[PDB]
Design a protein around this ligand. Structure first.
Ligand SMILES: O=c1ccn([C@H]2C[C@H](O)[C@@H](COP(=O)(O)O)O2)c(=O)[nH]1
Ligand SMILES: O=c1ccn([C@H]2C[C@H](O)[C@@H](COP(=O)(O)O)O2)c(=O)[nH]1
Lengths: 284, 288
């Protein structure tokens, strides 16, 4: 009798939102059921990797998006050319015009995650400019702090710059990240302002857990926990029936994740460096 | 009798860190016992106000500091004139020289919380420059969104600007704030990267709860919850015996907080606008 306690908690969180969450409208007039303020822990020990089993997660998308974020790119065509189309809808001529971004060419999302991570505070012009050496490279500064002052309680990476809100196709959801080191293990906490529990959360858990493994590898630490903290945790009313069905499913054990190469630095990671062992989701 | 569950939870979290926390040295050279990633909820309904009762919290400090944060000031002397001296250590001639801020005058804290709340992204020169209408006024933007777009999932106020870290004595601890409105009630979640469970947390909880009450009051909403999320939650080793004492005390019911006049905007509050009803704390506890 194996119990995947972490995935069960996630299912219980869906149930609680479904049964007791408050009705709320989203910014398109569509309805959700919502709660405010949740926190969930995922153990990364023994290579165990919290990819959800009760509905298949788009792992190839998680990996490629993340390596794209780390590169500092803001051009969704660079993802799309790798057959990952998740940012295509928010970088169309038409969507960009609806955001008032008339001078962005198709693919230009403005200064979204990767730009904030690697170039915080640099003025944005477009996705083709070279920003190398410009702004604050928070990602490298976090890595330096991990290696040089692991006790530090200031190991932070922010994606939230209100001065950039009018320049972005959409405002960041995964807003704030902190790292922590104790007893030779690296942990990460991420703060997510708004989380769709059905479609967003599972992919989010996987991106940050994978970032945690990456950083622990190139800082010579063992992985500890990923902590996910949410502001508005919600499910869309139109999803409620499908999620009820998912909730009848019995979670299976999490896969494991190995890193296959001695990677030089955070910018040297390649998709083939990661091996996902025994991922066995139900459909979807 | 009455059971103060939120205060018992705090005491239980103290117990947990003390009994099961990892030993971790720190910047200060004192060691800590530490856990990473905690979350606690405080109910603000029926005017109940989460000021801890197992020790006397520095309420007058909480109120004056928050009014001073709201003003956008970065001059500790403006707080010191209110006989609240908690920022004086970090703004002495002597102390600033040590962080290599030789050009700041005494009292100049750099762009700490108030500057970030009212003037985010404006370049900082000194505490005496005119910042009026410069930078991004996050606090008033959050107020406007609560009034105009209460359903929004983007009501955010950040205090974290990597470009400003080398300009302040100490980087902000209470970093990130989100507001939320549902069924006519305003809630607030605050993310704290670093929390001294003895000396800081009780004060910190009172600070954000009070901010939530203030905003609820000017937006004609009911107060809902304050949710406190922490990164590194720690106790200093030197504090443990004193916290041991505190943990044997039986929490009392929280006080109520009343606001005594109609206030229309965030900058218009005075210290005397707030009335604590029936705060019955045990005596103060001193900790290095
Ligand atoms: O990484 C993400 C990005 C978005 N969303 C969901 C949350 C909301 O349902 C919607 C974003 O809408 P706003 O919070 O910005 O209104 O997308 C996620 O769950 N994860
Ligand atoms: O509002 C505050 C400010 C500071 N601290 C504590 C946390 C740490 O013990 C110390 C700051 O040190 P660093 O985390 O910056 O090292 O002050 C608080 O708890 N609350």
């Amino acid at each position: 009798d194996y119990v995947n306690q972490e995935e069960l908690n996630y299912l219980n969180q869906l149930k609680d939102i479904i049964d007791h969450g408050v009705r709320k409208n989203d910014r398109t007039g569509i309805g959700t059921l919502s709660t405010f303020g949740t926190q969930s822990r995922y153990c990364l020990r023994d290579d165990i990797f919290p990819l959800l089993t009760t509905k298949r997660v788009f792992w190839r998308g998680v990996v490629e998006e993340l390596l794209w974020f780390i590169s500092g790119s803001t051009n969704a065509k660079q993802l799309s050319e790798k057959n990952v189309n998740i940012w295509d809808g928010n970088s169309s001529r038409e969507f960009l015009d609806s955001r008032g971004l008339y001078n962005y060419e198709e693919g230009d999302l403005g200064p979204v995650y990767g730009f904030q991570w690697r170039h915080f505070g640099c003025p944005y012009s477009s996705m083709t400019a070279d920003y190398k050496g410009k702004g604050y490279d928070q990602l490298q500064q976090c890595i330096k702090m991990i290696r040089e002052e692991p006790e530090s309680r200031r190991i932070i990476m922010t994606a939230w710059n209100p001065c950039d809100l009018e320049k972005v196709a959409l405002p960041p959801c995964h807003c704030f990240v902190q790292f922590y080191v104790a007893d030779g293990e690296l942990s990460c906490q991420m703060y997510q302002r708004s989380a769709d529990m059905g479609l967003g959360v599972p992919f989010n858990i996987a991106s940050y857990s994978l970032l945690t493994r990456m950083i622990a590898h190139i800082t010579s630490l063992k992985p500890g926990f990923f902590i996910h903290t949410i502001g508005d945790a919600h499910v869309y009313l139109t999803h409620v029936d499908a999620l009820k069905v998912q909730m009848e499913r019995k979670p299976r054990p999490f896969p494991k994740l190995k890193i296959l190469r001695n990677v030089e630095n955070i910018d040297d990671f390649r998709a083939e460096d990661f091996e996902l062992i025994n991922y066995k989701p139900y459909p979807k």
